[PDB]
């Protein structure tokens, strides 16, 4: 069988940069290579076939080169919408794929806009309280979210989720959800979300008082 290996596994580049990603076949495949672009929650999209032929409907900033065992995909001028995982695939034999290269956009620092949401009265009726902290449209990805309940730092009772990089502004958003029983929730007054991020001069706290 044929092994396809991509390098690097991931990269970060600025808008307008020339980006090159490589794909190595374990044996010669001549020109029997395709490149795909895959955006979050979507099927892979064919960009190049026969190593260097541009697929219909794909922008000319994408180009493929190479032959034999060593292939390259070049994006001449990286655009924010080009955030994706790119895959190569051989079709000399039984359609094997490379492991993908994740391309992320490097941009200027952007502080998150922070919002805190109390649990709904409807959820409280059911016996549980979910408290949500939203960090909206920030860059870079690295952020620290700490929960405080009546000024006591919380541990092990929250879960975070982060969006994939935005296709227009190249930012991330993050949710942190603090889950408590209704009884634990009603035993306390002040619910606070403390956010640390490079774009903030000091940590930002959003809070509410129960009731």
């Amino acid at each position: 069988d044929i092994q396809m290996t991509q390098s690097p596994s991931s990269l970060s580049a600025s808008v307008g940069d020339r980006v090159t990603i490589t794909c190595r076949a374990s044996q010669t495949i001549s020109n029997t290579l395709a490149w795909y672009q895959q955006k979050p929650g979507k099927a892979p999209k064919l960009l190049i076939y026969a190593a260097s032929n541009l697929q219909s409907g794909v922008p000319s900033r994408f180009s493929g080169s190479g032959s034999g065992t060593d292939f390259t995909l070049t994006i001449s001028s990286l655009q924010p919408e080009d955030f994706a995982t790119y895959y190569c695939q051989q079709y000399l034999s039984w359609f094997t794929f490379g492991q993908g290269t994740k391309v992320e956009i490097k941009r200027t620092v952007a502080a998150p806009s922070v919002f805190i949401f109390p649990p709904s009265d409807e959820q409280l009726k059911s016996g549980t309280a979910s408290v949500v902290c939203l960090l909206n449209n920030f860059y870079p990805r690295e952020a620290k979210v700490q929960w405080k309940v009546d000024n006591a730092l919380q541990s092990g009772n929250s879960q975070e989720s982060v969006t994939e990089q935005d296709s227009k502004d190249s930012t991330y958003s993050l949710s942190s959800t603090l889950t408590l029983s209704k009884a634990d929730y009603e035993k306390h007054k002040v619910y606070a979300c403390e956010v640390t991020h490079q774009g903030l001069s000091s940590p930002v706290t959003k809070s509410f008082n129960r009731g």
Binding site: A50, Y91, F97, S120, Q123, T179
Partner: protein
């Protein structure tokens, strides 16, 4: 143009059979200038071609060695579809499954893909989500931006889809990846930021659809107890 529409259950019990269908529009399953494929994607399998069917005055199949003993891909010339059957599934079979067209035999890449079907191999039962509003404080709107959302909690299996105002509102929407809770049920939130000035002229509704349980919930999200149909205090 050619379109591929996938269907079939996204939950299969361990040891049982996964069954999916790919419906073709704009081409024929029996085309002598195409081949019809199934390809899956997961952290354990990466992108993995599973097999193909194609007609050249006779039906032909090819299956990947990894699944050859358990797979069947059959054409339906009445419905213009092709199926995927994978027997005796295990948790290693949990993946997003795609159908795809290859011009000719596939020697020019796979140009047309279906939307994908997430198939989860689990003994757990389907459960529809509870949907709660994420209503911001009146104070948090003073900066010109209001963040609103919906918490989509305690469902199984993935996925859920969330739209806003029946798909009319897309700008500023962020639907987060789901997290698996200690209960073994998923939870996610979907948020949108809008101008604060719109909170009293525009209505915001999240439309949640969990296809495995046929659950559809449309939750209005606004910040006034005065006008409530059901009064308290």
């Amino acid at each position: 143009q050619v379109q591929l529409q996938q269907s079939g259950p996204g939950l299969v019990k361990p040891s049982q059979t996964l069954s999916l269908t790919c419906a073709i529009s704009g081409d024929s399953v029996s085309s002598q200038s195409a081949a019809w494929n199934w390809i899956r994607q997961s952290p354990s399998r990466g992108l993995e071609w599973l097999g193909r069917i194609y007609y050249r005055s006779k039906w032909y199949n090819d299956y990947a060695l990894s699944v050859k003993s358990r797979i069947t891909i059959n054409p339906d010339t009445s419905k213009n579809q092709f199926s995927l059957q994978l027997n005796s599934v295990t948790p290693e079979d949990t993946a997003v499954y795609y159908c795809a067209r290859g011009e000719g035999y596939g020697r020019e890449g796979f140009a047309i893909w279906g939307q994908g079907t997430l198939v989860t191999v689990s003994s757990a039962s389907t459960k529809g989500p509870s949907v709660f509003p994420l209503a911001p404080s009146s104070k948090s709107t003073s900066g010109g931006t209001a963040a609103l959302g919906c918490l989509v909690k305690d469902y199984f299996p993935e996925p859920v889809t969330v739209s806003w105002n029946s798909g009319a509102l897309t700008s500023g929407v962020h639907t987060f990846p789901a997290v698996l809770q200690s209960s073994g049920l998923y939870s996610l939130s979907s948020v949108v930021t809008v101008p604060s000035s719109s909170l009293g002229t525009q209505t915001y509704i999240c439309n949640v659809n969990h296809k495995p349980s046929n659950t559809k919930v449309d939750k209005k999200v606004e910040p006034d107890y005065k006008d409530d149909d059901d009064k308290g205090a």
